[PDB]
Amino acid sequence: KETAAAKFERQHMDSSTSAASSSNYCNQMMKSRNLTKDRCKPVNTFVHESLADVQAVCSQKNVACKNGQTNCYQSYSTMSITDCRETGSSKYPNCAYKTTQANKHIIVACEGNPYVPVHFDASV
């Protein structure tokens, strides 16, 4: 019922803040966005740029995705992003995350009409 584009927004967009300011950002946000409902999602990146800037990546540098498809794009510039990764102790339903704020290029897979991000592949 969620489109792929809408699910990308829910999982990855956080324009409301310019950077993670606390080490408990990931714990908060993974919970807020319902990424810990059934399982602790193991890895997830939040992007702190406008939706327009993130959609624009679908017109930038074409690269291969980790899976070998060729519909991925790398941002020409770096973006403010927060990297969330589940700690080794974390056990559902007590999900726990390490937060890393960074300025990196993003790589997204793009699909559809309009041609928009539907998968976060990596940061660089």
PDB file of C-alpha atoms in Angstrom:
ATOM      1  CA  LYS A   1       0.000   0.000   0.000  1.00  0.00           C
ATOM      2  CA  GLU A   2       2.979   2.351   0.505  1.00  0.00           C
ATOM      3  CA  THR A   3       4.538   3.105  -2.916  1.00  0.00           C
ATOM      4  CA  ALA A   4       8.313   2.458  -3.207  1.00  0.00           C
ATOM      5  CA  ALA A   5       8.871   6.246  -3.392  1.00  0.00           C
ATOM      6  CA  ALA A   6       6.828   6.844  -0.228  1.00  0.00           C
ATOM      7  CA  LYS A   7       8.653   4.097   1.652  1.00  0.00           C
ATOM      8  CA  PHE A   8      12.009   5.653   0.665  1.00  0.00           C
ATOM      9  CA  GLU A   9      10.813   8.972   2.136  1.00  0.00           C
ATOM     10  CA  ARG A  10       9.645   7.381   5.386  1.00  0.00           C
ATOM     11  CA  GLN A  11      12.828   5.345   5.805  1.00  0.00           C
ATOM     12  CA  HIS A  12      15.419   7.936   4.695  1.00  0.00           C
ATOM     13  CA  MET A  13      14.230  11.567   4.683  1.00  0.00           C
ATOM     14  CA  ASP A  14      14.829  13.842   7.715  1.00  0.00           C
ATOM     15  CA  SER A  15      14.877  17.392   6.366  1.00  0.00           C
ATOM     16  CA  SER A  16      13.546  18.692   9.721  1.00  0.00           C
ATOM     17  CA  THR A  17      17.026  18.912  11.170  1.00  0.00           C
ATOM     18  CA  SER A  18      20.361  19.824   9.628  1.00  0.00           C
ATOM     19  CA  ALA A  19      22.340  17.175  11.548  1.00  0.00           C
ATOM     20  CA  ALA A  20      22.013  14.610  14.312  1.00  0.00           C
ATOM     21  CA  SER A  21      22.918  16.537  17.477  1.00  0.00           C
ATOM     22  CA  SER A  22      22.831  13.625  19.943  1.00  0.00           C
ATOM     23  CA  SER A  23      24.045  10.033  20.151  1.00  0.00           C
ATOM     24  CA  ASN A  24      20.471   8.810  20.743  1.00  0.00           C
ATOM     25  CA  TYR A  25      19.243  10.214  17.380  1.00  0.00           C
ATOM     26  CA  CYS A  26      19.165   6.788  15.718  1.00  0.00           C
ATOM     27  CA  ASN A  27      17.359   5.114  18.616  1.00  0.00           C
ATOM     28  CA  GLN A  28      14.681   7.833  18.511  1.00  0.00           C
ATOM     29  CA  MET A  29      14.281   8.000  14.751  1.00  0.00           C
ATOM     30  CA  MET A  30      14.311   4.260  13.976  1.00  0.00           C
ATOM     31  CA  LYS A  31      11.439   3.990  16.485  1.00  0.00           C
ATOM     32  CA  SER A  32       9.591   7.134  15.237  1.00  0.00           C
ATOM     33  CA  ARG A  33       9.626   5.928  11.592  1.00  0.00           C
ATOM     34  CA  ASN A  34       8.409   2.429  12.528  1.00  0.00           C
ATOM     35  CA  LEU A  35      11.619   0.737  11.412  1.00  0.00           C
ATOM     36  CA  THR A  36      11.632  -1.388  14.579  1.00  0.00           C
ATOM     37  CA  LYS A  37       8.054  -2.752  14.340  1.00  0.00           C
ATOM     38  CA  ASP A  38       8.511  -6.431  13.479  1.00  0.00           C
ATOM     39  CA  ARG A  39      12.328  -6.557  13.634  1.00  0.00           C
ATOM     40  CA  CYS A  40      15.240  -4.220  14.336  1.00  0.00           C
ATOM     41  CA  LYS A  41      16.139  -3.003  10.818  1.00  0.00           C
ATOM     42  CA  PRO A  42      19.972  -3.544  10.949  1.00  0.00           C
ATOM     43  CA  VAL A  43      21.251  -0.570   8.954  1.00  0.00           C
ATOM     44  CA  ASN A  44      19.635   2.716   7.844  1.00  0.00           C
ATOM     45  CA  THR A  45      20.686   6.139   6.645  1.00  0.00           C
ATOM     46  CA  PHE A  46      18.796   9.414   7.183  1.00  0.00           C
ATOM     47  CA  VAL A  47      19.392  12.323   4.852  1.00  0.00           C
ATOM     48  CA  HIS A  48      19.177  15.940   6.084  1.00  0.00           C
ATOM     49  CA  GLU A  49      18.610  17.727   2.784  1.00  0.00           C
ATOM     50  CA  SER A  50      15.505  18.909   0.985  1.00  0.00           C
ATOM     51  CA  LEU A  51      13.462  16.293  -0.853  1.00  0.00           C
ATOM     52  CA  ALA A  52      14.105  18.269  -4.040  1.00  0.00           C
ATOM     53  CA  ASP A  53      17.892  17.922  -3.588  1.00  0.00           C
ATOM     54  CA  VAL A  54      17.572  14.174  -2.971  1.00  0.00           C
ATOM     55  CA  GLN A  55      15.233  13.629  -5.989  1.00  0.00           C
ATOM     56  CA  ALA A  56      17.721  15.612  -8.109  1.00  0.00           C
ATOM     57  CA  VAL A  57      20.305  12.858  -7.571  1.00  0.00           C
ATOM     58  CA  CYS A  58      18.335  10.746 -10.105  1.00  0.00           C
ATOM     59  CA  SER A  59      19.738  13.160 -12.748  1.00  0.00           C
ATOM     60  CA  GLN A  60      23.375  13.085 -11.548  1.00  0.00           C
ATOM     61  CA  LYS A  61      26.134  10.479 -11.846  1.00  0.00           C
ATOM     62  CA  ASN A  62      24.973   7.099 -13.133  1.00  0.00           C
ATOM     63  CA  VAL A  63      26.699   4.130 -11.424  1.00  0.00           C
ATOM     64  CA  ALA A  64      26.053   0.444 -10.807  1.00  0.00           C
ATOM     65  CA  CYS A  65      24.078  -0.576  -7.713  1.00  0.00           C
ATOM     66  CA  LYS A  66      25.538  -3.130  -5.282  1.00  0.00           C
ATOM     67  CA  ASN A  67      23.157  -5.668  -6.877  1.00  0.00           C
ATOM     68  CA  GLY A  68      24.514  -5.139 -10.402  1.00  0.00           C
ATOM     69  CA  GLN A  69      21.554  -3.126 -11.754  1.00  0.00           C
ATOM     70  CA  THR A  70      22.460   0.150 -13.480  1.00  0.00           C
ATOM     71  CA  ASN A  71      19.690   2.462 -12.212  1.00  0.00           C
ATOM     72  CA  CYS A  72      21.780   3.931  -9.348  1.00  0.00           C
ATOM     73  CA  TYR A  73      22.999   7.512  -9.125  1.00  0.00           C
ATOM     74  CA  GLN A  74      25.662   9.155  -6.988  1.00  0.00           C
ATOM     75  CA  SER A  75      25.257  12.747  -5.784  1.00  0.00           C
ATOM     76  CA  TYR A  76      27.845  15.089  -7.279  1.00  0.00           C
ATOM     77  CA  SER A  77      28.185  16.826  -3.913  1.00  0.00           C
ATOM     78  CA  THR A  78      28.225  15.588  -0.317  1.00  0.00           C
ATOM     79  CA  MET A  79      25.045  15.722   1.806  1.00  0.00           C
ATOM     80  CA  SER A  80      24.434  15.851   5.550  1.00  0.00           C
ATOM     81  CA  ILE A  81      23.518  12.263   6.513  1.00  0.00           C
ATOM     82  CA  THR A  82      23.245  10.151   9.668  1.00  0.00           C
ATOM     83  CA  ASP A  83      24.289   6.522   9.581  1.00  0.00           C
ATOM     84  CA  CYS A  84      22.391   4.222  11.957  1.00  0.00           C
ATOM     85  CA  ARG A  85      23.683   0.727  12.702  1.00  0.00           C
ATOM     86  CA  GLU A  86      22.297  -1.804  15.172  1.00  0.00           C
ATOM     87  CA  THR A  87      24.754  -2.676  17.951  1.00  0.00           C
ATOM     88  CA  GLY A  88      25.842  -6.258  18.460  1.00  0.00           C
ATOM     89  CA  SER A  89      23.980  -6.563  21.775  1.00  0.00           C
ATOM     90  CA  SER A  90      20.632  -5.161  20.419  1.00  0.00           C
ATOM     91  CA  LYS A  91      17.810  -7.746  20.619  1.00  0.00           C
ATOM     92  CA  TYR A  92      14.242  -7.260  19.337  1.00  0.00           C
ATOM     93  CA  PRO A  93      12.248  -5.632  20.812  1.00  0.00           C
ATOM     94  CA  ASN A  94      14.973  -3.647  22.575  1.00  0.00           C
ATOM     95  CA  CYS A  95      16.636  -2.246  19.427  1.00  0.00           C
ATOM     96  CA  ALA A  96      19.774  -0.153  19.971  1.00  0.00           C
ATOM     97  CA  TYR A  97      21.743   1.844  17.381  1.00  0.00           C
ATOM     98  CA  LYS A  98      25.059   3.617  16.939  1.00  0.00           C
ATOM     99  CA  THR A  99      24.661   7.073  15.392  1.00  0.00           C
ATOM    100  CA  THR A 100      27.266   8.536  13.027  1.00  0.00           C
ATOM    101  CA  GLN A 101      26.671  12.001  11.596  1.00  0.00           C
ATOM    102  CA  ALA A 102      28.680  12.697   8.418  1.00  0.00           C
ATOM    103  CA  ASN A 103      28.938  14.667   5.161  1.00  0.00           C
ATOM    104  CA  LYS A 104      29.058  12.071   2.349  1.00  0.00           C
ATOM    105  CA  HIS A 105      27.876  11.457  -1.238  1.00  0.00           C
ATOM    106  CA  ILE A 106      24.725   9.352  -1.420  1.00  0.00           C
ATOM    107  CA  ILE A 107      23.914   6.632  -3.932  1.00  0.00           C
ATOM    108  CA  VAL A 108      20.253   5.877  -4.608  1.00  0.00           C
ATOM    109  CA  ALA A 109      18.344   3.670  -7.042  1.00  0.00           C
ATOM    110  CA  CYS A 110      15.730   5.518  -9.126  1.00  0.00           C
ATOM    111  CA  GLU A 111      12.546   4.271 -10.747  1.00  0.00           C
ATOM    112  CA  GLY A 112       9.241   5.350 -12.181  1.00  0.00           C
ATOM    113  CA  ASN A 113       7.489   8.292 -13.789  1.00  0.00           C
ATOM    114  CA  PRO A 114       8.425  10.636 -12.294  1.00  0.00           C
ATOM    115  CA  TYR A 115      11.892   9.115 -11.945  1.00  0.00           C
ATOM    116  CA  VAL A 116      12.511   9.243  -8.202  1.00  0.00           C
ATOM    117  CA  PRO A 117      14.590   7.503  -5.505  1.00  0.00           C
ATOM    118  CA  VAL A 118      13.193   4.168  -4.360  1.00  0.00           C
ATOM    119  CA  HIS A 119      16.237   2.560  -2.630  1.00  0.00           C
ATOM    120  CA  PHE A 120      19.231   3.839  -0.645  1.00  0.00           C
ATOM    121  CA  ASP A 121      22.277   1.913  -1.886  1.00  0.00           C
ATOM    122  CA  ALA A 122      25.259   3.436  -0.054  1.00  0.00           C
ATOM    123  CA  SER A 123      27.116   6.533   1.056  1.00  0.00           C
ATOM    124  CA  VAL A 124      30.624   7.470  -0.027  1.00  0.00           C
TER     125      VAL A 124
END
